[PDB]
A paper describes a structure:
M1 from [name] virus (M1-C) has been shown to be the key component in inducing the formation of protrusions, called cord-like structures (CLS), emanating out of infected cells and in regulating their growth thus demonstrating a role for M1-C in membrane remodeling. We show that the N-terminal domain of M1-C adopts a similar fold as M1-A, despite the low sequence homology of both proteins, but coordinates two Mg2+ ions which increases the positive surface charge and may thus facilitate electrostatic interactions with negatively charged membranes. Full length M1-C adopts an elongated structure that tends to polymerize into ring-like or filamentous structures via lateral interactions of M1-C protomers. Our study thus confirms that M1-C assembly on membranes constitutes the driving force for [name] virus bud formation.
We solved the crystal structure of C-terminally truncated M1-C, (NTD, residues 1–155) by single anomalous dispersion (SAD) techniques to a resolution of 1.5 Å. The structure is composed of a tandem repeat of two four-helical bundles (helices 1–4 and 6–9) that are connected by a long linker containing helix 5. Interactions between the two four helical bundles and with the linker are hydrophobic as in the case of M1-A structures28293139. The overall fold is similar to known M1-A NTD crystal structures28293139, albeit their low sequence homology. Major changes are observed for the position of helix 6, which moves approximately 10 Å outwards. A notable difference between the M1-A and M1-C structures is the unexpected coordination of 2 Mg2+ ions by helix 5 residues. The first Mg2+ ion is coordinated by Asn80, Asp130, Glu126 and three water molecules and the second Mg2+ ion interacts with Thr83, Glu123, Glu126 and three water molecules. Nevertheless the presence of Mg2+ may not have a structural role since circular dichroism showed no difference in melting temperature (TM = 62 °C) in the presence or absence of EDTA (ethylenediaminetetraacetic acid). However, the presence of the two Mg2+ ions changes the electrostatic potential of the M1-C surface. In the absence of Mg2+ this surface is substantially less positively charged, while in the presence of Mg2+, the basic charge distribution is similar to that of M1-A.
Author numbering: 2 to 155
Write the structure that this text describes.
Amino acid sequence: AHEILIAETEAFLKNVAPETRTAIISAITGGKSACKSAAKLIKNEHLPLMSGEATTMHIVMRCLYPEIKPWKKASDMLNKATSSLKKSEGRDIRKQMKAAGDFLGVESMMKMRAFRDDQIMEMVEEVYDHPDDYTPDIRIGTITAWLRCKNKKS
Ligand SMILES: [Mg+2]
Ligand SMILES: [Mg+2]
């Protein structure tokens, strides 16, 4: 569903410059080495992105290629954003994510269970903190659904 992911990332980045957006999108669709390089560029904050835009893009990139190490700024952010969740609540979310299977499943899970922002964000934290615990379909689906949610507020 990486095609839909790319589309949502493009929309998420609509307000940045072309070359810049083009540089990011071209890299993330350019293979593992290209995406890795783009993630390093992102975390070093050389591009003129807002803090939230940079962390969002690093999450997208690590979700695509989990060999990319975690950026503390993004990691810490997801921790704070979900700090009010009981461990039991997160346990339920892990199971439900897995059972969701793919993008359509994950989107449906978020909507039909009327998830709060913190619950959505716990799904994103699961894929960012523990990408290897989830299939590519779940990682991409979760991040796509998350980006779709944000873009609908634009
Ligand atoms: Mg965490
Ligand atoms: Mg958490």
